[PDB]
Design a protein around this ligand. Structure first.
Ligand code: CHL
Ligand code: CHL
Ligand code: CHL
Ligand code: CHL
Ligand code: CLA
Ligand code: CLA
Ligand code: CLA
Ligand code: CLA
Ligand SMILES: CC1=C[C@H](O)CC(C)(C)[C@H]1/C=C/C(C)=C/C=C/C(C)=C/C=C/C=C(C)/C=C/C=C(\C)CCC1=C(C)C[C@H](O)CC1(C)C
Ligand SMILES: CC1=C[C@H](O)CC(C)(C)[C@H]1/C=C/C(C)=C/C=C/C(C)=C/C=C/C=C(C)/C=C/C=C(\C)CCC1=C(C)C[C@H](O)CC1(C)C
Lengths: 201, 202, 201
């Protein structure tokens, strides 16, 4: 069987708990899943390569002294911008991000006409043609690849929700919590931290 | 639509992408919730401009034991609210009058209690159009357009009240105080710098 | 004029605030209510009998030590544990609890075939084929008595939600809070607690 975990994909079946009234939700959760996938991975990798929590990473790059993020990346012996130049600038990064992500979102969602000329209908979260340089979808199964991605989508969104509530409970960070739970499983869990009071009680 | 350009839409204008419109009672609830929110956000706006007390702390000034503090709080007042010598707006006094007046108005708004007026005023209609609009602004103005204006103000003010309650929970400083801090230096005074400070808990 | 209150029962009428959802919700609210009945009664009785909150009561039986719960039951002729060996140890109780409850839930919902084969159908709101040994309510106005328990379900669920929320607010316990209210409501209240700050502000 395909998708036998719990419930069924939006493409086929009905939610056990929700009515699934609106068909905008399907692609919404695809996009949300993909973003979460990149977010969870980011939180996984940053705290490994740098040791900082993902939720306090924002404090390193601020409109004054954004140079803290420079050279934080593993390997990458050259910093983001040279030391002493002070060019890692929150506003410069923010403007570059605003223009790039805003243009990408406008192209995806039809706020602006697509720059390309080859199909790419607005609102489809599986474009394929331009977004498969390797040609893995035509070689593989399209439907089961889409199901795998969905499983990853929902798994990563649930992992992100876990990351934020772990951040709120323990105030430490995802990987450090994972390592504490691995080291002493009985003595590092949610009920253990509840016995400590979650840091406020 | 042409008239409603906001992200969402008005009930009857169409259907919302998220949580589409169900029962009409939901639309009545939205309008009334808006109306009370407009009143609430305006009160939280004007009171601490007049005297500086955040709305989430203004409750405790009046207490069953002592309620003198609420008297003479309104700026510009010619005299005390009740005798200067012995202010008599006691919390119980306030309650006993207000529960009766508000309960009456509510039951008479919804018609669970027989209407006093019986002027053709039909309960369960957000726009009574009777004595409530003596100016009859709706009669001169265009009623569809004006309904859209009312709902836009409803949603804006309900969102503003949500902002007021969450700002109270994060910064516990006060709405206009948060405004003045942000206008003072928005770059270094906003939600994310308060997050860096930790919202007062972390 | 049965159920002449704010709302209506799932069988007749429609939900005033929330969309009625599905039949799955209609069967599920009752089960949540039965569990909330048991939970609220357990919190009430454990606190009257022991004096320590239901929430903190989870720290009494830890993997390292479960002997604290040995002599907590009021009016017990002897402690359940021998007091001297600490035989519970949280592991026997955990394992037998998970097997018994998991089996019971599996048989309730037909995850596994029912063993009685007494004609009972899985997923029924009120099976009653062997869940009414006394028969006092089976014979005579069954529909009304379902309304009775329905009203108790919604109450116990609301009471549990209030229990968890004011546990969060005050961190003292439900009936400690109830005694504080009853002794002098006017100076010991939710709004008084908010003005002083529940545990914060
Ligand atoms: C939507 C994407 C995104 C999300 C979810 C976050 C989320 C966060 N950022 Mg980041 N950021 C994001 C994008 C960006 N941030 C920054 C720059 C910063 C700074 C400068 C700071 C944060 C901070 C924070 C944290 C607290 C602020 C908040 O709103 O939580 C409120 C809490 C909720 C639960 C939301 C409901 C939180 C983990 C702050 C921080 O680290 O505080 C500890 C901080 O000071 N972020 C930039 C500019 C490059 C971004 C660009 O898109
Ligand atoms: C040959 C150069 C070089 C080498 C050996 C490594 C080596 C490594 N990098 Mg680095 N990196 C290098 C260049 C760069 N890295 C990064 C950005 C990153 C990221 C974003 C990540 C790594 C990660 C890793 C690890 C896999 C490993 C420690 C990954 C890791 O696991 O971090 C611990 C990871 O996620 N590197 C950039 C962009 C500025 C580079 C540019 O030159
Ligand atoms: C000579 C009389 C008189 C004068 C000049 C003022 C003048 C003022 N009052 Mg006061 N009031 C007066 C009598 C009274 N006021 C109030 C109750 C209020 C309220 C409820 C409000 C004011 C507000 C204001 C301010 C309007 C600023 C803007 O607009 C201003 C300081 C407003 C304010 O705070 O704006 C800053 C406001 O919201 N006054 C009452 C009823 C108790 C009064 C009775 O006579
Ligand atoms: C629409 C009605 C209404 C609303 C929304 C509020 C809202 C509030 N009052 Mg006010 N009040 C209201 C009517 C009245 N109050 C008072 C008199 C008081 C007093 C005496 C006190 C409050 C307090 C509070 C706060 C309670 C916060 C809380 O419980 O934790 C948060 C709850 C949530 C987030 C809900 C979920 C909040 C700002 C208390 C306070 O904050 O004191 C500083 C307090 O002590 N109010 C009277 C009678 C004269 C009212 C009459 O209708
Ligand atoms: C109590 C207030 C309230 C009520 C009853 C409604 C009701 C309605 N709105 Mg309105 N709306 C509101 C507030 C409200 N809205 C606010 C504040 C905004 C601005 C963000 C809007 C923006 C809006 C748009 C843009 C649209 C609607 C639409 C609708 C209809 C869709 C069905 C629905 O969502 O109902 C259920 C009612 C809800 C309020 C949804 C629940 C929201 C959840 C619970 C999140 C809220 C979190 C909460 C504030 C947490 C507080 C915690 C705090 C106390 C600590 C219905 C008539 C749609 C419509 O009519 O389309 C034809 C539509 O397009 N509304
Ligand atoms: C576990 C929580 C839970 C669950 C699953 C439900 C589920 C349901 N309730 Mg119940 N209810 C609950 C909590 C819950 N309620 C509590 C705590 C209260 C007390 C405030 C109520 C009071 C209540 C009323 C008053 C009504 C419902 C109704 C309903 C239906 C509405 C659909 C829905 O929300 O799903 C469904 C059977 C409605 C219904 O069955 O429609 C006729 C209805 O009229 N419920
Ligand atoms: C005081 C609360 C109360 C009341 C008066 C009833 C009353 C009734 N229930 Mg409900 N019920 C309750 C609590 C309550 N129940 C709780 C806590 C549980 C869980 C242990 C149940 C589990 C339950 C089941 C599983 C069944 C009933 C049945 C019945 C009937 C016997 C009668 C209508 C039976 C029935 O109606 O059979 C037709 C039936 O099948 N109820
Ligand atoms: C039927 C359920 C139920 C019952 C019997 C009680 C009973 C009680 N509560 Mg609890 N409570 C409930 C639901 C309930 N509450 C819910 C749903 C909430 C969350 C909104 C709370 C939050 C709450 C707090 C924070 C506090 C109490 C307190 C109290 C006691 C005094 C009443 C009071 O000041 O607050 C009554 C407030 C409510 C009933 C909330 C009503 C909100 C809905 C939306 C209306 C009393 C024992 C207080 C206490 O003992 O300390 C002095 C206290 O500090 N309760
Ligand atoms: C990497 C990085 C580094 C920096 O340090 C900081 C930083 C913040 C920038 C960060 C960047 C992160 C990013 C870009 C994140 C993007 C995240 C996103 C899009 C998250 C979405 C999260 C979604 C959630 C929770 C869903 C909850 C919904 C639930 C359970 C309902 C489930 C439900 C339904 C639907 C149907 C069933 O039948 C029944 C049930 C009830 C189960
Ligand atoms: C004035 C005063 C002074 C004293 O000092 C103190 C004091 C406390 C007494 C105080 C008194 C104030 C009072 C009485 C206030 C009354 C306030 C009221 C009625 C608030 C209502 C607040 C309503 C909210 C948040 C709604 C949230 C809903 C949201 C986002 C969903 C939005 C949604 C929908 C629906 C469908 C779309 O498709 C899209 C999306 C998903 C966005």
């Amino acid at each position: 069987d395909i998708y036998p975990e719990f419930g069924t994909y939006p493409g086929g079946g009905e939610s056990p708990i929700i009515p699934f009234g609106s068909e905008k939700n399907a692609e919404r959760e695809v996009i949300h899943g993909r973003w979460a996938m990149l977010g969870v991975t980011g939180a996984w990798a940053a705290e490994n390569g740098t040791g900082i929590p993902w939720f306090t990473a924002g404090t390193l790059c601020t409109p004054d002294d954004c140079t803290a993020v420079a050279d934080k990346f593993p390997g990458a012996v050259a910093p983001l911008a040279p030391e002493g130049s002070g060019y890692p600038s929150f506003w410069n990064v923010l403007i570059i991000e605003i223009v790039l992500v805003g243009a990408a979102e406008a192209y995806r969602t039809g706020i602006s006409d697509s720059p390309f000329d080859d199909g790419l209908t607005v609102g489809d979260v599986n474009p394929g043609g331009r977004f498969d340089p390797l040609g893995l979808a035509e070689s593989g199964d399209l439907e089961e690849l889409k199901i795998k991605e969905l499983k990853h989508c929902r798994l990563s969104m649930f992992a992100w929700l876990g990351c934020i509530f772990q951040a709120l409970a323990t105030q430490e960070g995802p990987i450090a919590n994972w390592q504490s739970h691995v080291a002493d499983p009985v003595h590092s869990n949610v009920l253990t931290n509840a016995a400590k009071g979650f840091g406020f009680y």
